[PDB]
Design a protein around this ligand. Structure first.
Ligand SMILES: [Mg+2]
Length: 223
């Protein structure tokens, strides 16, 4: 599995979303270089204006590109599932507001790594920080805590994303995640550890569509 990640790998992301009945789709393209834990992706909302803030979708939009140091490579679930792939599911609970439920399939289509996602958001406040677009266009560094789920032959993750609000405050987004292999081949079930993430959001000056440019670095640690 990890053999598939020693070079630059093209990535496609496709999402269909419904948040409070606002229906939207996003298509993303870019590439990943797991040797450096590095992702570069550009996302376009193909249905018009995105009805939630872009930063709220960053985690939903390929942890197989994390850099696992050599001494921790026996703990890399994500690459071990490839090329058949894994299902990734989350509940993202926005404090004092609604939640996203997401289901994705991450797998190779030929030599390309594809993340296909369905997102459902409910019980959002009409002018809370998400539907009122009060979140700043930036992103904080943070840790993703991974644990094995032996019974599902997979992993769980639990973590907190803090989204900066334009008034200086923070919108917490609690993340609960489960991943399970799609293939029947053996996978790596890791000891407890975490992914240390860093993410930078930007705009393409020549792009008039609603979009997001993402540069991310992710390194495994904690062992
Ligand atoms: Mg501030």
């Amino acid at each position: 599995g990890e053999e598939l990640f020693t070079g630059v790998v093209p990535i496609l992301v496709e999402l269909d979303g419904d948040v409070n009945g606002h229906k939207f789709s996003v298509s993303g393209e870019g590439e990943g270089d797991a040797t450096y834990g590095k992702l570069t992706l550009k996302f376009i909302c193909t249905t018009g204006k995105l009805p939630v803030p872009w930063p709220t979708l960053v985690t939903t939009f390929v942890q197989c590109f994390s850099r696992y140091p050599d001494h921790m490579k026996q703990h890399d679930f994500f690459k071990s599932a490839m090329p058949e792939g894994y299902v990734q599911e989350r509940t993202i609970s926005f404090k004092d507001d609604g939640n996203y439920k997401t289901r994705a399939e991450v797998k190779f289509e030929g030599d390309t790594l594809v993340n296909r996602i369905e997102l459902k958001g409910i019980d959002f406040k009409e002018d809370g920080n998400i539907l009122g677009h009060k979140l700043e266009y930036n992103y904080n560094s943070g840790n993703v805590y991974i644990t094995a789920d032996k019974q599902k032959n997979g992993i769980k993750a639990n973590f907190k994303i803090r989204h900066n609000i334009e008034d200086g405050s923070v919108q917490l987004a609690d993340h609960y995640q489960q991943n399970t292999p799609i293939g029947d081949g053996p996978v790596l079930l890791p000891d407890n550890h975490y992914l240390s993430t860093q993410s930078a959001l930007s705009k393409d000056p020549n792009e008039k569509r609603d979009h997001m440019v993402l540069l991310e670095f992710v390194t495994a640690a904690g062992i």
